[model samples]
Each structure stands twice: as structure tokens, then as C-alpha cells.
Target chain A: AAHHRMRWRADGRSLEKLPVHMGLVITEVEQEPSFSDIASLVVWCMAVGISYISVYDHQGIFKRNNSRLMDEILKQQQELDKDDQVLNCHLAVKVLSPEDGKADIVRAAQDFCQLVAQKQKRPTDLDVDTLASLLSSNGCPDPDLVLKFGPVDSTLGFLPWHIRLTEIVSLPSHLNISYEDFFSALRQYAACEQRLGK
Target chain B: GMSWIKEGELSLWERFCANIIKAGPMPKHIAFIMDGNRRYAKKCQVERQEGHSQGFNKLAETLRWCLNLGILEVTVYAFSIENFKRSKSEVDGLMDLARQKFSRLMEEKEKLQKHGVCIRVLGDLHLLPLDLQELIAQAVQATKNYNKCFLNVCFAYTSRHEISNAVREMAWGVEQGLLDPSDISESLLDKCLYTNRSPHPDILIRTSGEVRLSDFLLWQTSHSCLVFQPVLWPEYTFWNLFEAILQFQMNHSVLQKARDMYAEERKRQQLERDQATVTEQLLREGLQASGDAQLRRTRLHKLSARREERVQGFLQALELKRADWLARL
Candidate 1:
């Protein structure tokens, strides 16, 4: 039944699979999880081939303990298959908050001006991209979809720079969620069409 | 070769939904706020850090869910400047964790490059420890050329701070005569922002049951669809995202219409301002003419009439465009 829903050509080939490179989760309320849940999540990521993942919270709790989570994930993956090739996927995780933005850009700008001063050039001018480059020299990528797992319809200080064209989804909570629920979110994401303010 | 299936396979219904979703439009960029680690810890009777660790796992799964769905970019807020106000131990712990993750990112540079993922750290670098900043810089430099995927980590960030800094630079530009006051339009301002290279978000999600901007993306989210969920950060699942997309689909037309209307409004206002400027210049020139009063009045009257005619023509064209847009809709 599900196979029929896919649009296939007469030759049995599909147009293309849309892949999400970056995934963001804003959980206003932090929650704990079982070892199984964590392990399953790692397996699921590898199956889908996500390149990067970033978890955010208000208080930096997740930012502080993300390594432990990775440790558990490795253990889980090893237990499931000692020779699992998922490690080849090269998933990079980062824990974040609101502090790692804006101010540093200002500092960068100031630095740029100060550097110019040393050269005895008083032409204090910087283009947007120059400023942008300085700010994003750390290489921040804009988000494509935002998953908010709380009851609030807000960003709560997510990346102001990167979320201009992102898609946001809200869930009631992340506790006791089933795989069905997770699949549904993916389906919903797959269904969204971004007009890009057109 | 990567295995295609696991023991617990997707249900038929799930497959159907997935196929249907794949056939339609999907989001290209996604942002997240993993809320509720402390609450989850309390609920599960575990240490706060333990709950946070669980949240990390959830994030990994969420990324996979997004990738399968065809979204390409993700940004997350990991640390806020205010997080520093928390207990010293917690703050230090978070900083330590940041160092580990950032270093790991550099360590896996080759693999990430192979996967074509670009890693970026967004926010105030000076505020962080020197070692962490260096690691972040290294990771960003290593993955600067990859374009397959984007992951932005927001640390020590806030919307107010971001906007203020942009404004400060604009101000500096004005002071230095590098920018004209009239040239500071929305696009110009956007170019000055930290996210100058990224597009505006179509949708914004905040989890953990709160319904506030909380100083996040205030400038960029003007037209973004906002979603607030009640799920804890660690327990957030894929279904929640699915439901949110459904809602966005339902509202897509409306959102697009609103955006079109806004663009039209801006265009109309700019035209009007230009006309005003033209009228002002014409009148001033007319007054300055060293001629008889009668001749001057005649010239002024003719100029005013021409300006009025131009304005009317502009209004008519605008009305026609609006009608055309409506008819197309």
C-alpha cells in the first residue's frame, strides 16, 4: 500500500530522495531516557545517514553531558554489532545554547577595525559578507527544520542567524514516545513545501 | 554494505505516510531547542547531567529522521550566555563537554569531509575558553568547503545580542561615512547580520511547553511558523515533527500570501517615497528659477501636475499587480 504512494516512473525509478543534512531539536523541557532509547537512536541515525546533529537546551545541561551520551551510543552500537559500519557515517554532535552567537561577531568586527588601525588605514568600512565571514568563520550552517518538543510556540533563542528559512515542528513532549510517533514526524517533514517567503 | 532493515521494521501505515510525505514538499532547514533535561532528570530520578546525556541520544535520532526526510540544514542552541549564571559546577561541566565535542569534531574531520558535512560554531567566541574556541575554529576551517550538509551550534548566543551587534556595525558604518543613512534597508541590514549567508527560517520550533521567543531569532523569525511542544528534550520523537509539518502544510498558502502582501506593501511605500523625493526636488528647482512670478507659477503647476499623474499611474500599476496576484491565487 505504501509503495503505491511513491511516485515512480514507468522504469521503476523515483525522482530523488530528499535528505536532511542538519537536524535541530529544541526541547524546552529536558528529559532522561533509557539505554535502549539512546542506542536505538544511534542505530536509526546511521540507517538514515545523518551527517550532523546538534541538541539545544536553555541551561546547557545537554551541552555538558553530550560526551557521555556518545559513549553510551558507542557501547550500544558495539553490543549490537561489533563490526557495525555505521561508524563510517561520521556523525558529529554539538551541544549548544544562545551564548555562542552575536557578541563574538562584534568582537570580530572590532578586531577587524583595530587591525586596520595598525596598518594606518582609517577607511573603516566592512561589507556584509565580510562581517558574515568573520561571524561565521566558525562555519555555522542554517537549519532546515526545527523540532520543538514542548508546548511553547517559540524559538527560545535558537540560532538567530541560521533559522531564517527553517521549518519548525512542535510536539507535546518527548516522554514515552514510540517509533510510530517518530516516523510520523519524518513523514510530516517530508510533506512540507518551503516557498521561501514567495 | 549497509543493511537496509532491522528487526523492528517500519509498519505499513508508517511506510504509507513516509511515501506520501516524500512525494510532497519538505523543509530544507531545521532548528531545535532541546528543553527539559532538568525536568527529565527529576522525573526519572537521575542526575541532571544524565538526563542531558539522554537528550543527546534523542538528538542523534532526530538528525537521522530529518536526513531521511530530505532536510539539509540544522542549527541548534547549545549554550546561552545566561547559562553561565547557573551553578559554577554546572557551567564548568558544560564548558568541559563543549571542549570534548569540539575536539571530537576536529578529530573526525576526514570522516565528516567524506560525508560532506560542514560544521560551524555560531556565537560569541571570546566568551568561551581559549581551547574550545581554537577547536571550534579548527573544525570550521576543516569543513569550510563541504556543502552536502550544515550543522550550526549556537553557543553563548542571544537574538538581542546578535541584532545589537549588527546595528552597532551599521552605526559604525554611518559614522565612518561608509554607508548612507538611506541605504540601510532590510536586505542591507540582513547582510550585516551573523546569518548573512543563510536564508530566513520558514518554520521555528520551541519545545518544552513554553510559548515565547526567549530572545531567539527575533529578527529572522518575522514570517516563520512557530511551533511549541510539550515534550522534554530527551524524549522528543519523530512523530512530533511529523505533526508539525502537517500543520505547516495546512498553513503554507496563508503564510505565502502574507509574505506576498508584505512585499507588495514595501514596494508601494518605496515608490511613494521616491515620488515624494522627486516632487520635492522639482518644487525646489521651480522656486529657484530666476524668472517672472507668472512663469514660475506656471512651471510649478505643470511640474505638480506631472508628479500627480506619475503618482496616479504608479497607483494604477500597483492595483493591477495586486489584482493579478489575487487572480492567480
Candidate 2:
């Protein structure tokens, strides 16, 4: 019950062996630990499993969480080790958001059709009217180009996952967000996007 | 999936998108509130720290998605100033993850430079651990002049802090006679603030069903359109980003025109006020004649009534649309 020691009990060991608990065996990697590997795993968990896990550098800095929260998900060949498949540590994946954006709204709306293009690393030629129709309908699609109007604040959480890694355009206007303001933002987005990519 | 270019179009999807993207309607700067890390952690049945750690991977992928779409600037809320007050275990977990990412960045330094992506940290970085502070400083300094792309990571930051810091800086300047008190305007303060160099967010995306701002980018999002997606941070994908852009593209031209028209309308209204004042002054001073005034006034009144009626009709249509807007919200 000392936490991080329960894994031993699952392995047919007891709590009296807390002396050897510090030497808990961690599993190894099968594929190379590329950044994409980490990304794919997390994305899959969030989308499919409705869950995820986070692993950080240097375990000592973190007082590791309870072992019951973990699962022995996978075993793989250790790239750093001379032996293959010897690593027996399981990646502590979690189930997070069970419901993705509404499927019905997403399917019928033309605005989000460009997301398929994005997933394919391609571009889209969606018009504003088309997008507005899609965004305003049902589940509410996020705009590709951001247009925000309000009092200035450095730490207002908009949508963490939805707006992850986006260009920002801050205007001095407050509260009364207008179509004109949003269009100006679109202009900026267009200008800079063309300037950089094309 | 619908292509940016129609099936019978003469252009490729990329070219079509590029054309549309450049046609004066696009989101130039997008800011993400980046909510749902805690929920993501809880859902995973892991410590909250694990959520933040997974959030990092999502962040990196999101960046790639933005770059691919030709978005030049991307700002993410990595950590909040208040986040420091969380449990020691959580803080340590985040710090540990932050260090890991930094270390990873160092190893990928060449790749970053090659991509021409500039990195800017917006916050009270000094409050972090000395090593992290130094790492942040080094990252900024190293990528200070990069122009091909930008990633503004907001860590340990708050709008109030930014505003107060801006005020403090201005006060220092005025005390030193470097700035005149009369020169204090919103733009002046904006230029002196931490994100002075970066443009405001054109669109703000909130995730995980949170309908609140939750204290991210207060001043900068003044004109940003809010796009809330239900996806949690860990589950966020390139498709989600693309959808937001598609929506932005749809209203790009109309919104831009509306803005220009509004500004012109304001100017015209001012001019009308000035003209009306001059006419009133002339009448008050008895400089105008009253001869044949009834016949002229009657004709003028009829014309004015017709114009007023037309205006009213147009306004009524707009009012109806406004009601619909209210219903949607």
C-alpha cells in the first residue's frame, strides 16, 4: 500500500519487499521513440480510448502516482538495451474525453470539411458563407483563422485543444465583437499566411 | 470529404486553399485557451501531471498542423501563473515535463533553426526554476530574429500581471522622463507590454466544453471570434484545427468589408454632426431668410419622410437578423 509498490503484488510479490520496490522494472521501447510516436499514442488515446497519459523527464523530480492507476499495456524491444523485448514497463495511458465533437453536426456541416484536408496535410478553399453556415450550426465548428474581440487579458482560456498552436491577432476593441472586426482578423490571417507560405 | 477545390475545378486543393486563404479573408493570428488538460488527466485515471505531459505532445502536433496550413503565428497557453499554486506533486510533474521538452528542444535545435520558427515566452519567467528560466531565455534569444514562423508559449502568465507589468514599465519611463504622461494611450501601453511585438488573436478556440475565459489572453483577444470545440487537449488533432480555419475562411470577406464600412460610417456620422452644428449656428444667429419657407419646407419634409421610411425598413431587417443571432447564443 506504499504506492508505486502495488505493481509487485500484481506480480505475485508482497508489501514486505518494499526494500526492493525502488528497483521496479520498467519496460522497453519497440519502435524508436520519435516525437511522432508520442503524439500518435496520445491522440489515439484521446480520440479512441477517450483517455491519455503523460510521461516526463527524470522520475525523481516527480513523486510518482499510485500504481493502481497504471496498467501493463505493452511490452517491447529496448532500443538502448542490448537485449530485445526485455523491457517490461507499461505506458500508463488514460481515457480522457469520451465524446468527441458532435458527429451529426460535423457530418452535415460543410465548414469542417476542410479538417479532412488538414489531417491529410492539405489545404482547403472554403468560403466564409460556407464556414459560417457550418460553424453556426449544431456543434459549433472552430474557425481556422481566429478573430477575437475583447478586453486584453494574457491568460484567458479560450479552447485548449481546439485552438492549440494558432496565430493570434489582438485588437484594441472590447466586448462588442463585430463582423467587421472578425473580417479584419481574416484579412490579417490571409495576408500573413500568403506572405509566409506562398 | 469535401475538397477546397471542386471536383471539376482546374486547380489543386492546395492552390485553391491558398488562393482563398489570401483573398482578404483568413485568420491571421489564432490563440488557443488550451483547456482540458486536467480533465484529460483525470479521464486517463492518471495524476494531473500526466495530463500536462500528454498535452505537450498535442501541442507539438498542433504546431505542425498550423505550419502546414501556412498560419504564421501560433500562441499556446502552456502554463498559468496561478497554476503554480497547485499541489507540489502536480507542479513538480509539470516542471519535470517542461524540462524534458526543453531538453528535447535543445537536441532538436538544428531542426528548429532550419524551420525558421521563432519562439517567444510571454510571462513572468523569472519565477520558474532557475534552469527553466535560463532555458526559456536561451530559447528566446536563440530564436529572437526568426521570421519564417513563430510560437508564443505563454507560461506562468496572466493578463493582470501583463497589464500591471506594463504599467510599472511605463511608470518607470515617466519617472525617468523617458515618456510624457500625455502620451499614455492604449496603443502606447500595448507597445510596452510583454506581447507588444505579437499581434492579437484573430480567433480564440476553447476546448472541453468550458464556456468561460478561465484567464487566458485577456487584452489580446478583444476582437477575436470564439470557437469552442468539445475535444479535450490530449485528443486534439489536425482535423480540429482545419475545421476552425475553414470556418474562419467562410466569413473572411464579409467581415473585412463590414469592418471597413463601420469605420467609414463612424467618420461619416462625425462629418454629419459637424455639418448639422454649422447649420444650427447659422439659424440661431438669424443669418438665414424666412421668405417662401413654408412651400420649401413642405417639399423637403416629404423627401425626408420617404428616406426615413426606407432606412427604417432596412434597419428592421437587420434587427430581425440580430434576434436570430441572440437566439443562437
Candidate 3:
């Protein structure tokens, strides 16, 4: 996907495109798509300038099939890179399952222990920065936007620590998700003005 | 004042919500960032305090909806610490209203007790006036034992401050030697939070079209389904809550799975810590044993030398006796 530069116009209409740092996709049952869908999703995220993307399914199917998925994604990336006009940003993609929830917490604890040892402080001595350091060490960021393709309204187990300010949008299902659907979610996020809980 | 006209079809709407609520997962705990009161009042050309009153009225109605829906707990952002930084007159007005609400809660304690509703005032109550704090304390004390339902009013609260408070307490524990530096973990921090007694909110709803959490229960709403309704706080209706619940049902499976994973992680961490403690104990004991082994080796060497000297002395005495016998022959 190529980046679309916004041209300044005299009309001065608000067309702000806020960069999404991390994007999470919660897919529905039987809605798991083929390599093409995954490829398109990666392209969409790149087009939107999201630095990181995570795909999650409840039953460990995504994690189980991650290798083949990544291989196909890499092939797609190669093909996209071959095109001189395509803009590519180094993207970190993770296909996570329910077990990663525990993995993340355990990883955070390990990091916390290391921090306590390094800083010569107790666990209770941690502030937001220290806690944030523990989380970032796990290669996770507070998602700027969360997109769920399901009938449900729940976040479906995205990392809790990072989602405090994340903007979430729910679509009906992922069976026929298109680039427009993805873009629309980003548009909604762009329209949002974050007051930072003031 | 056309009030009955507005009230006429609300029952039917409530009935519709009830029927639909059965089709989806219901939220066990719902937290509300009640916003837009002042804005709503301004839009209506009314006093700001009146807007707050309207918001309070909406909260009362929402609580009834929650009870009807079997929601176990409701936490409302009544007053924020930042709010206290506002003009003295507005702050005083809010405090006056809070006192009235607390007194009402105390007066209605018997009814609340019958319904098994527990009332709690969250935040730094000490920052409030002494009399207001007393009123809050009495209300909390009156309903402290109830478990069927909970109502939490956040007064002078901010998530950052709350977390800071928890961390400060934990640091003090270390200073007092009551807590070990190694014993810190995510769950320990969770326990230190102000909302530690309450389960994490399953759904966090913010009104007035605001998307951010505004530091309300920031530490507690980690995987909660966040719903931002464009409606003002005073304009929020039961249907708004119903819609949020419907959305919650959609996310329920993933939410539950996430919660289960979190619990599993906590258990795993606890086990790991236990193993570490055991390993540490074993190392300490091993060191002590090694020290004892060195002392025992020295003692054994002295005893062996003493035995060897006695044997040599006996050989000398035997040799002298043989010589004496030969001389006598």
C-alpha cells in the first residue's frame, strides 16, 4: 500500500489522519481468511502507518498456523516491495492466542524483577514509567486503535495494561471485511479527539 | 410539563431492553464516567449545579436499570481530583450535593440493606471536608456488610494518584520491613489499588462522546469493553446502558478468555515466586552445610593425629620392655 499524502486546499476542511501505533484485530469464528486476506490486512495497516499489528483468535488456531501465515505474509511483502511506488514501513506483526495473555503477564513479572534488581527498589516502588518499561520490554504498545470483527462488544482479551486510552470500534463480522471497512475504522479513530482523561 | 408524555413509552422500551438483554452476556460490573453535566446545563440554559443534579438523577435511574439487569456492581465517577481544582464556588456546590446524597443513602440504609446493596465511597476522602468524609464513612459503614450489590462513588479520585498511593503504601511496607523487595508482582500492585476490593469493571462507559478514561479507575479497567456514548450524562437513558450490555455480550467470550488467561498468569507467577523462594532457601542451607563440613574436617584431622601419636608411643614402650627381659636373661 502506498502512502497518500494530504494536499493542502483552500477549503480548509479537517482531514487529519492520526497515526496508529498499534492495531489489534479480534476475528470471529469461521471468519479466518486465506493468505490473501492476511496480505491485504498487512497492506492496509501499512497504508495506515501502523507500526505494529496483532491478530488474535481464541482457540490458538492463529498461533498454531503462524509460521505458514508469516511465510505467506513475507512473500506478499516481497511482492509489494518489488513495486517501486509502494511505501513500506518496518512492521512488527504478532499472531497471538489466549495463552499469550498469561505469557505477557509472566514476561512483565520477569521484567519487573529485573527492574527491581537493577534499580535496587521494591516492586511497590514502581511508577507508571517502570510499569510501562516492563510492558514495552514484551514488545507490546498501548494500541492506538482496536478493531473487532464480531457481534460482540468485548475486547476479547487484548493486553489490559495497554488499552486504557485505546479507541475501539466494532464491526459486524470479518467474513467479508474489505479495505474500506478497515479504513473506516481508522477514520473513526481520526475523528476522535483525545482529551487524555482531562 | 409534558413529563408524563416522556414517561409513557419508557416502560415499553424497558421491556424491549429486558427481552434483548437475555440474548447476550450481561456485564457483572459496569463503571460510568458521567460526563457533560455542565455542558448539558449550558446547552439547556440552566445553572451548572442543576446540570449536576440532573446527572445525579440519571445515575439513580441507571442504578435501577443495573439492579434490574442483575449487574452486581456499579462505580460512578462522581467527583474527580482535578474537579477539585475548579472554582471554589463550583466545588463547594458539588460538595454540598454530595453531602445530601450521602445523607440520603444513610437514611435509605434499611431499604438498601434489604436489597443487599453495599455503598462505598472511593478516592481520597480525606481531601474532602471533615463532615462530608464523616457522612461518607457512615454510609460505607452502614452498608459495609452487604454483598449482593455495590455502589462506588469516586470523590476526589484520579487513577494516577490512586496508583501513586498504592505504590507509596507498598514502598512504606518495604521500609517497615513488612514487605520484601522481591515480593513485588503485578497482583501485589493490583491489591494495592483503591478498587482492590471490587472486581475489574467488565465494561467502562463514558458519556458525552468522550473516548478517554479521564483517569477514572485507570488501573482497574484493563480489558474492559469501552463504550463511548455521545449522549450527555443528564441525557443518558436505560436504553443507552442496554446497548452497551449488548455490545459487552459480543465481546464477552474474548473478555472471559482474557480474564482466564490473566488468572492463569497470576497463578503461574505465584508458583514461580514460590519456586524462587524455595531455591533461595536451599542455597542458604547449602552454604551453612558447607561451612559445617570445613569445621568437621579440621576436628577429624586432629583426632587422627592423636591416635597416630598413641600408637607410636606404645611401640616405644614395647621396645623398652624387650630390652629389660634380655638383660635379665
Candidate 4:
């Protein structure tokens, strides 16, 4: 019945066959009628043998970030200013001489902090949605395991709530991240079963 | 490959894993006290102001490292509430750097917002000049709902002052009837503090070899484990933090499990009590409906007695009789 719709998503990978008469249980639960469908999906997943993991994509250009770039620039300036080299220090002074409207930056950063304090008092719907996504879409919560391939340092917005207490294995850049690396983190986490002195 | 790892050429991974082997699980919440800008300045023999400027750069690098390690909650000590005790030149220099960092932040705000990294600055803003305060206000306003990772830069923060402020806030809340004065617990005060959004730090890492907390998160640190590393803030690296986590794991592996157990037990007990209260209330109501006036009074007395018995039963299970419970209270 859903074959045409299913075919559109088939470009990447395809399942061998679709079940015709799968036994699916659905329930309707909601804080409001509008939320009933979402609640029902949660119930349906629970009824079936499927585990849901949700993750949020807080995607941004952290790499090539202007702020961090400026930070680097500032570091170089400081280095030049520190050295006895007159030309370098002169260049540093010239580079940093601009009025640059610093007021706005501090004003914005301070305001940002205040807002976070307020937001933290009550995490918004976005927080809830992210948690749901992490559990449902990513399945990060299911494995008691997470494997990061490629750059070990690449943390692509791992959900804090779910990964709060998980073991992490930071593998080498040259080495491929594998299940073996994940299990080691698991084992390390499992070890130290004794009451620590902290 | 093994030789490269051994010689520190291949990667910091093997060393990190070896260290984790020595410690245990990674901390859920990690905090950094970005200290030692002045010393770096002193070492460089430059005007101390430049050192503070350099320190901001160090903070950025440290942040990226923590993020890379998958740490969610990170708090850094930038300026203490009492740091004004320093010479005016130093303070002015610090403020200048803050202004520079803020301006850069404004330009990069959209980019960071896209990356899902939320930024928060905690402390008394009133102490800062008006412009800096406004900058902070804008940043907080812009990133209110960003949920990727929380970067808490504690500027002008002092744990003692923060707690005092919390006390004042709760008092205001009580006056406004928003918070219950009687229900004002330590947690209640903590929730009112600036770092309220972030959970209590599981690991508090202090750089510059400082063993003391220096009045940072005093109320919150009651539950946090302190890790003192012998590296200065400027020289502090990701491996140092990882090693600290390893040590933390070594110390807290068992305690973490026990705390988890206690948490579960407490939840179970609370649920049981709630269920019992509802059941008892239902029985009392049903008895009152079924009996005549005098008979209802008799049934009420019996029900009260039965409730007292049940209470005694629960208390006895914990090896405390009713009198013992009352006397202890």
C-alpha cells in the first residue's frame, strides 16, 4: 500500500521486502488532542520491539568561526606584544588599534548569559524536542555504546542528557574507530565497581 | 604506530585510553577554572594586561577540547566577583579584552548558534561597565534556546556572593509568593543561582595547581568532586582534563553506583508512600459513606488505628518503632 512512498526513500539503502500484515499496536495519549498523534507513536514503539534514540543537530560553522579566529589573532598579537622585537610589537599595536565597537560584544555576551540563566530555569520545547530526537532518531540510548568514526575529536552535537554518564573512547586520528574501541570504553566504565574515595 | 604513540607522535588517544584505564568513566559535568593569565604575562615579561588578553585565547581552545571530548556542561572562571581587588590597570586591561572577545562573539553569533553551542556568562553584571553588561544581555537574548552544548563562562563569579544573591532572590520569591519560604532547601537556592540551567558539576577541575575552590560554586560544589591538576591554565591541555577524569573515575567508580542505587531506592519509596496515601484516603471515604453516624465514628476510629498500625509497620521495617521515629524527629 505504501510502496510508492517507500520507493522515494529507496535511493540510499533498501530492505529486501516489506511486511504486508505486520502486527502493530497503536495507542492515543496526549496532553492535548493535537499531541495525540505524537503520544500514540511513543506508545506504538513501546508496544513493538523497537527502541528509539533521539539526537539534536546543533549545526553551525564552529570551524572557521570568526570569534575563535579573532581569538587566534589576539593570541598572535599578544605574542608579538610580549617579544622585544620592535617591528612585531609595532604591527601588533596597529592591528589592535581600531575602536572595533567592543561595547556591543560585551553587551551581547552578557545578555546571552542572562538569557541562558532564564532559559535554564525552564528548558523550552526545543530542549524536549532534542531529547526526543536523540532517543528516537539516533538510537544513541539503546546500545550502551557509541562509536565515533573518523576524527575522534568530532563530537557532532552528542546529546548531553543521554551521554551524560557514558564512557568515551577517543581513538587515534589515523586509527579507524570500531566496535572494539566502543567496548573498551564500556569495559573501562564497567571496571572500578568499587566505591571510590571521592 | 605503537612507537609513535609511545613517543607522543602518533596520537594522544592511546595515552588517554591508558589514563582512562587508570581512572574509570568520564565525568558527566566538567568545570574549568581558567586561571593564570598574570603568570603567563610575568613569564613573558610583558605588561600584565597582555597576559589577560592571551588567557581569553586559551579559554577558546579549552572549550573546543571539552566539546571534542563530548563533555556537555562546562563552566570556566573568567573573572571573580572579588577580582576588583587587583590594580586598576589590570582590571581595565581585563575589561578591554572582554570587550574585544564580545565584539568577536557578536560577529560570530549566528555561526555559533548554527553549531548548537550555547554560551552563558554568570556573575554580577552590575559590577561591569554598562557597555559590557549590554553585550552580555544581547548574547543571552540571542542564544536562549540553543541546545547543543552549554559553555558557561563565569565572569565576576564568586560562589559565596552567588549564594548570597540566591538567598536574596528566594526572599524576593517568597515575598511575591512565587517560592515557598518553608520549602527553601539547598537545592532551591542552587536553582536560583546563575548556573541554574546547567546541572551540578560532577567534576570540578582546577588548573595552576590550586587545591582550593577559591569561592567558586560553594553551594553547588557540596556534591562535586574536585580534581586538582598541576598545570597552569595557559598550559592546560585536553589530556590534563582527560587525566583528571581518569583520576575522578578511580575515586568515584563505586560511589557513582551507590548514588545511583540510592536515587532509585528513594524514588521507589516515594512512589510507595504516595500509593499508600491514596489507598488509605479511599478506604476512609468509603467507610464514611457505608456506615450510620455513630457507626461511621466507630469505623473512623478503627481506620485511624489501622493507619497508625501501617505506619508502625513501615517504621519497624526500617528498625525504628513509632516512638523512636517521633523521638528522633
Question: Which candidate would rank higher by DockQ, 1 or 2?
Answer: 1
DockQ of each: 0.03, 0.01, 0.19, 0.01
Model 4, global lDDT: 0.48
Compose the digit string of candidate 1's lDDT tens values, residues A1-198.
323223211111221222244444544444553334433443444444444555665444556666666666666555424334444423355556544333334355555645443543333345434555666425655555555665444454455555544556666665555555655655555666543211
Q: Write the per-residue lDDT of candidate 4 for residues B75-110, one digit (tens) a residue.
A: 888887667877787778788888877757777776
What is the overall TM-score of model 3 with all chains considered together?
0.70
lDDT of 3 at B201: 93
Cα error, candidate 1, residue A93 (Å): 48
> Which candidate, 3 or 4, has the higher DockQ?
3
Cα lDDT tens digits for candidate 4, A1-198? 535334423411232222111111111111222222222322222222223312111111222232442344344334213454333323221111001111112222223233334544322222323323423223223223232222212122232223322223333321222334433433443341211111
Say which prediction, candidate 1 or candidate 2, comes out ahead on lDDT. Answer: 1
Write candidate 2's Cα lDDT for A1-198 as tens digits: 233234323422311111111111011112322333333332222222221133211111111332322222222111105222212233223221101111112232212323332343111223323333442222433323332322322212222223322344555442233434534543454444211100
Rank all candidate structures by their lDDT, best first, as comma-separated numbers: 3, 1, 2, 4
lDDT of 2 at B230: 82
Candidate 1, superposed: residue stretches over 4 Å from native: A1-198, B1-15, B287-329
TM-scores of the models, in the given order?
A: 0.54, 0.48, 0.70, 0.48
Give the range where candidate 1 chain A is weakest over 10 consecutive residues by summed lDDT: A7-16
Interface RMSD of each candidate, angstroms, one decimal: 12.3, 22.2, 4.5, 16.8
Writing each residue's lDDT as its tens digit, candidate 3 over A1-198 gives 321322112111233655445555555556454655655666557544566777776555667777666766667655543443232332467776644643454355545455444566675656666655655334556677777766545555555556656776777766656867777777788788764334
